[PDB]
Design an enzyme around this catalytic site. Structure first.
Site, short mmCIF file in Angstrom:
data_model
loop_
_atom_site.label_atom_id
_atom_site.label_comp_id
_atom_site.label_asym_id
_atom_site.label_seq_id
_atom_site.Cartn_x
_atom_site.Cartn_y
_atom_site.Cartn_z
N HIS A 88 -10.77 6.19 -7.74
CA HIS A 88 -12.19 6.12 -7.42
C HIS A 88 -12.44 6.15 -5.91
O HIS A 88 -13.60 6.24 -5.49
CB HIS A 88 -12.82 4.88 -8.07
CG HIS A 88 -12.30 3.59 -7.53
ND1 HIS A 88 -12.94 2.39 -7.73
CD2 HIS A 88 -11.20 3.31 -6.79
CE1 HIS A 88 -12.26 1.42 -7.14
NE2 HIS A 88 -11.20 1.96 -6.56
N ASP A 117 2.52 1.18 -0.76
CA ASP A 117 1.23 1.21 -0.08
C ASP A 117 1.47 1.58 1.38
O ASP A 117 2.60 1.68 1.84
CB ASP A 117 0.49 -0.12 -0.19
CG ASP A 117 -1.01 0.05 -0.23
OD1 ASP A 117 -1.63 0.27 0.84
OD2 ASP A 117 -1.58 -0.03 -1.33
N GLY A 175 -0.37 0.00 -4.74
CA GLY A 175 -0.28 -1.25 -5.43
C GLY A 175 -0.84 -2.39 -4.67
O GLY A 175 -1.14 -3.39 -5.23
N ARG A 227 -3.85 1.97 -10.09
CA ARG A 227 -4.96 1.09 -10.42
C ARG A 227 -5.96 1.06 -9.27
O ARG A 227 -5.62 0.63 -8.15
CB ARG A 227 -4.51 -0.34 -10.78
CG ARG A 227 -5.56 -1.04 -11.67
CD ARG A 227 -5.24 -2.49 -12.01
NE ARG A 227 -5.34 -3.36 -10.85
CZ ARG A 227 -5.11 -4.67 -10.87
NH1 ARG A 227 -4.75 -5.27 -12.01
NH2 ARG A 227 -5.22 -5.37 -9.75
N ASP A 250 2.66 7.20 1.61
CA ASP A 250 1.33 7.75 1.85
C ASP A 250 1.17 8.90 0.86
O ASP A 250 1.73 9.97 1.06
CB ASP A 250 1.20 8.23 3.30
CG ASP A 250 -0.16 8.84 3.61
OD1 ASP A 250 -0.68 9.62 2.79
OD2 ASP A 250 -0.70 8.55 4.70
N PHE A 251 0.41 8.68 -0.21
CA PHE A 251 0.34 9.73 -1.23
C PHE A 251 -0.42 10.97 -0.76
O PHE A 251 -0.59 11.90 -1.57
CB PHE A 251 -0.28 9.19 -2.53
CG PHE A 251 -1.51 8.33 -2.35
CD1 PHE A 251 -2.60 8.78 -1.62
CD2 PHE A 251 -1.57 7.07 -2.90
CE1 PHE A 251 -3.75 8.00 -1.48
CE2 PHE A 251 -2.71 6.28 -2.75
CZ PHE A 251 -3.79 6.75 -2.03
#
Ligand code: 9Z7
Ligand code: 9Z7
Ligand code: SAH
Ligand code: SAH
Lengths: 396, 396
Positions: free
Chosen positions: A304, A260, A235, A300, A283-284
């Site tokens: 990418h 984040d 985010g 969001r 931490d994804f």
């Protein structure tokens, strides 16, 4: 002579302007056609061979803008069009007056500045635009860290004979910055003096992303208790959350989370708490999604940054962990690249991400990213003329 | 809305086109004004803030052109506008079809190629222009060796707090290529595989330099014996000599000499001898001018490679050695930069030379270069609308 070709191209410019100047608000296609025809007219005026020199003009112009901005020439010059001499500018910034004069030759002829007289220059609204929030966060970071790698795309691909060896940790960015192994976020965050400039650039939103594209009021109000929750994963600043709290306001005392990495949550924690949202470090890539069973998990301008495999699936699986099958849902918010008629706006974002192993996805590319992670397409939320869409998904 | 601003800019484009389309041949000023107004119209269409994103569009476009050219996409595609698919192109070049598709998005929307259909592309005369002699020599060398340094101008100046530390052997080129100490010619010639591409780029002459600007027939025919001689110092290919043998042909059996460094004289020796000129190796930095008392010593596009001091004076003094006071003469042929109203053509040449310690000089800059070397200004040979002039000089 070729004067024939100029005349036909001027006619198309006039014709396209007339079309644009009588369309309604339906980012228009008419607006881009008029740009296209304007661009043709220049190229025709120059002729094919001299127009191929515009790569060298373009490179020095970017190089000169970057130098002038970094040396404080934009901030030293009177906002509003009042003139200032080379010597004055040189005095207030310490930039060598000789370099400054040479550099100004690339940003006055057409460039965003105005050459008022010999060694005399003024701002215009196009130069002063480099001082606004969006550009001032985005341009220095791109020019100090990204432009170099992008130019080195050719060098990187050459080393593998034009084959796609590109990865998140081995790419034109690792090549240019001599940092093999580190992803870009890793390398930039490692030095703490980069955290402020990079998080500001992350806030950049020049094209003004449309946040009303998805019905936040509906899905979030039909949510009882622990399902009344929104996680804005990576985010960052939170502006996407602020805009979702600013696109449905009849809240059932709802839970708004912004995850984040640590140094980012650090920069925005105080300002995020203040606005009533909760900042948690996550931490994804390493961890699993902490907050279980929220009605949406929202992404969001994250995907990418990453290829389908490995990091792509690892994101989607680390947060599949916390999803209720029938009550949690995943929202991916990103550019949707058309398979034909892409613009320079798709191109600069996609090809700049190429330098760090990222990529803007087509609609078919998102389809495969879902399949690979065992997710069902619910709906592709598009308001055409928007470059962004939202990929809505549930567990298969 | 701003539709008002578009309309006023279209009017100026039309007005400038009408002016350009009814002027005579007197590189016109009308032609550049029409380009200027075309450029304004684009910027106005985009608006100030979105127009500041054109640095990122420009960078990826250059990066994509460079990659596509180096990977042979331009040569694989049918000259003449016939279409070819991503897969076909990918097959004939070995460039990853996925990279190729992404790269093509930067050179079709406006770029010099045409997106005929999905994954389908054609040349235009603007893409095929990259294959002509001028561009094909000049563009790869600039993009493989020069664009990188230019972008690093900011980094170099930063290290000295925006002060001019720039030298021929310590500059953005030595910084980027990690070769402190070597001049650019030194570094490129050191690897023999660069000699062919670099000498070809040295032959590039996109703007078609006007060689009839000076009366070669007059000064060279009033020359008895050993004074009937022309030295084309750092003559390189010889085309400047060929053009002087092609701008006075009633020769009194005259002596035509082309001096350059060894690996250059090597590439052109056979073709230079054949055309009846004599190739001698010479280093205007280490040695003194061998051929004594020739009516002219001629320098085309050499002095913009070097600063006044040290190399500048060392050139002029090493060849003052061989000059007759009253019968030899020095001709410096270079861009003459105006003190106001410079174009992007001055800017890209001057600022690219900045990266290697070179520079394009104003008329006043040439005056000081003469003074510092004890030479008298004879005449500044200009045919206005020419960017080149000839600085004619004799010993004081
Ligand atoms: C350098 C700035 C960051 C790190 C933020 C950036 C990351 C983004 O993805 C999370 C992003 O969305 N970005 C921008 C959006 C924007 C600016 N104005 C209007 N939209 C942008 O300028 N730069 C980027 N971007 O480009 C797609 C990048 C390309 C290569 C490396 C890093 C990035
Ligand atoms: C890279 C090519 C060389 C070595 C030849 C070049 C040297 C030149 O000076 C002797 C010159 O005159 N050049 C060109 C002329 C041209 C091309 N089309 C129309 N005129 C050109 O492209 N590149 C250059 N140039 O630019 C001024 C340079 C800038 C920085 C480093 C090296 C150079
Ligand atoms: N491994 C990781 N785990 C979680 N977040 C990460 C991450 N790596 C990068 N990120 C974050 O992802 C963000 C992408 S840019 C900010 C995106 C934000 N949602 C917006 O649209 O404005 C960065 O702020 C970055 O710190
Ligand atoms: N130290 C040196 N001594 C002599 N020539 C040199 C030199 N260093 C570079 N040069 C030559 O100077 C040339 C400049 S570019 C070629 C210029 C040519 N007269 C023309 O106008 O087309 C190069 O060919 C290069 O080899």
């Amino acid at each position: 002579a070729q004067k024939i070709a100029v005349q036909k191209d001027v006619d198309e410019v006039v014709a396209a302007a007339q079309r644009f100047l009588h369309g309604s608000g339906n980012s228009d296609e008419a607006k881009v056609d008029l740009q296209k025809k304007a661009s043709n007219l220049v190229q025709t005026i120059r002729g094919p061979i001299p127009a191929a020199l515009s790569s060298m003009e373009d490179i020095v112009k970017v190089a000169s803008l970057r130098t002038l901005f970094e040396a404080g020439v934009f901030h030293a010059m009177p906002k509003g069009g009042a003139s200032m001499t080379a010597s004055e500018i040189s005095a207030q910034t310490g930039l060598d007056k000789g370099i400054l004069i040479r550099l100004m030759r690339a940003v006055t002829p057409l460039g965003p500045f105005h050459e008022v007289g010999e060694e005399e220059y003024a701002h215009t609204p196009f130069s002063e635009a480099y001082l606004t929030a969006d550009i001032a966060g985005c341009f220095p970071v791109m020019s100090n860290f990204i432009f170099g790698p992008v130019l080195q795309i050719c060098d990187f691909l050459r080393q593998n004979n034009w084959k796609d060896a590109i990865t998140t940790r081995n790419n034109p960015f690792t090549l240019a910055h001599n940092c093999p192994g580190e992803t870009m976020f890793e390398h930039l965050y490692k030095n703490s003096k980069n955290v402020a400039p990079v998080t500001k650039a992350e806030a950049a939103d020049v094209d003004q992303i449309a946040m009303d594209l998805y019905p936040w009021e509906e899905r979030l109000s039909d949510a009882k208790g622990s399902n009344a929750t929104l996680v804005d994963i990576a985010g960052s600043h939170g502006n996407g959350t602020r805009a979702i709290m600013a696109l449905a306001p009849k809240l059932n005392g709802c839970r708004f989370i912004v995850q984040d990495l640590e140094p980012v949550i650090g920069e925005h924690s105080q300002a995020l708490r203040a606005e009533g949202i909760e900042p948690q470090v996550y931490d994804f890539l390493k961890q699993e999604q902490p907050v279980h069973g929220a009605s949406i998990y929202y992404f969001r301008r994250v995907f990418h940054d990453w290829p389908d495999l490995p990091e792509g699936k690892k994101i989607l699986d680390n947060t599949r962990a916390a999803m209720s099958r029938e009550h949690s849902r995943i929202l991916i918010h990103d550019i949707i690249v058309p398979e034909i008629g892409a613009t320079m706006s798709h191109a600069w974002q996609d090809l700049s991400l190429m330098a760090i192993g990222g990529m803007e996805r087509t609609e078919k590319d998102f389809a495969r990213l879902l399949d690979i992670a065992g997710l069902a397409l619910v709906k592709v939320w598009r308001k055409p003329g928007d470059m962004m869409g939202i990929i809505e998904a549930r567990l298969k």
